[PDB]
Structure formats: C-alpha cells, structure tokens
Amino acid sequence: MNPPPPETSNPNKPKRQTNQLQYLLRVVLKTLWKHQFAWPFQQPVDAVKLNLPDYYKIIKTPMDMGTIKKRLENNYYWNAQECIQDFNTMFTNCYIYNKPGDDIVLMAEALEKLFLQKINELPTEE
Ligand SMILES: CCc1c(C(=O)Nc2cccc(S(=O)(=O)N(CC)CC)c2)[nH]c(C)c1C(C)=O
C-alpha cells in the first residue's frame, strides 16, 4: 500500500516570506508544473493504482511536485535549500527505481534540465 504523503505543514516551525521562496513557487515550480512531462510528478506515486508493489520498498524518501507546491504555499520551508533538496530527491528517486531509457526517466531528465535553467536565476540570499 501507499504511505501517507509527505507532511506539507509544520505547526511547530516559524514562517517567513523571502524573495527566494517566492521565486521557487512562482517561477521554478510554476514553470516545471506546466511542462508537457510534469504530470507523472504532480502527485505522489500511487503504487496501488499503478500496481508497483515494490516502489515503497525501494523508495523510502518519496517526494513529488504536488507536495513541494503545497509546502511552498504553506510556508513549510524556512530555507530555500530545503526546497531545492526536495526537487533533487524527486529526481534521484526516479533514477533509483527506473531503468535507462524508460519513458519516466526521459521525462525526469527534461524536467531536471529545466529545473537547473530556472534555479540558475534564483535571487541571492537575504
Ligand atoms: C512509472 C510510474 C511513475 C509515475 C506516474 O505517475 N505514472 C503514471 C502512469 C499512468 C497513470 C498515472 S495516474 O493514474 O496516477 N495519473 C493519471 C494520468 C496521474 C494523475 C501515473 N510517476 C513516477 C515518478 C513514476 C515512477 C515509477 O518513478
């Protein structure tokens, strides 16, 4: 079965607005979200629906853009690096579970390339 999705709010953490965090939502996340190959990454992998019984045996740190989007909207992240790390985990999971040349791997590669193009212009830390 599926685990609960990653937490998207933290009642026990203070919250702040920053140019970097707002950029990660409105520019980085928004641009990847609208890419033709974003769809397999817009929500947690549903291993029951997809019939992938070993997915959560292999992937113990799941992550997806739907979670990242909610985390940004909810001010879950204090440091911009926390968000960048979540994107990295999402891509790395894909490379762990799947094989070279799989459709999903090509889709991750396109997204990851776009991600690097967008974080290139991340505002400086304040
Ligand atoms: C290859 C399986 C996979 C997906 C994926 O999402 N594939 C998917 C395929 C068909 C339907 C649905 S779906 O029914 O859940 N669906 C309707 C279209 C989405 C709304 C999802 N994502 C990742 C990161 C992986 C892996 C294993 O790395």
Q: Tell me the CATH number at 56.
A: 1.20.920.10
Q: How determined?
A: X-ray
Alpha carbon distance 109, 18 (integer Å):
29
How far is ligand 1, taken at its centre, from the CA of residue 106, in Å?
14
The type of residue at 20 is Q
Q: Are 4 and 44 in contact, with CB atoms under 8 Å apart?
A: no
Residue 95 maps to a domain: yes
Spell out the alpha helix ranges (H) of the chain. Answer: 19-23, 30-33, 55-58, 65-73, 80-97, 103-119
Residue 105's domain comprises 18-122
- With tokens 């990295």, the residue in question is 88
Ligand 1 atom nearest the C-alpha of 52 is 27
Q: What is the resolution of this structure in A?
A: 1.7
Instruction: Please state, as a whole number, how many other Cβ atoms lie within 10 Å of the Cβ of residue 77.
Output: 24
Domain count for the chain: 1
Contact 45, 55 (CB under 8 A): yes
7 lies in a domain? no
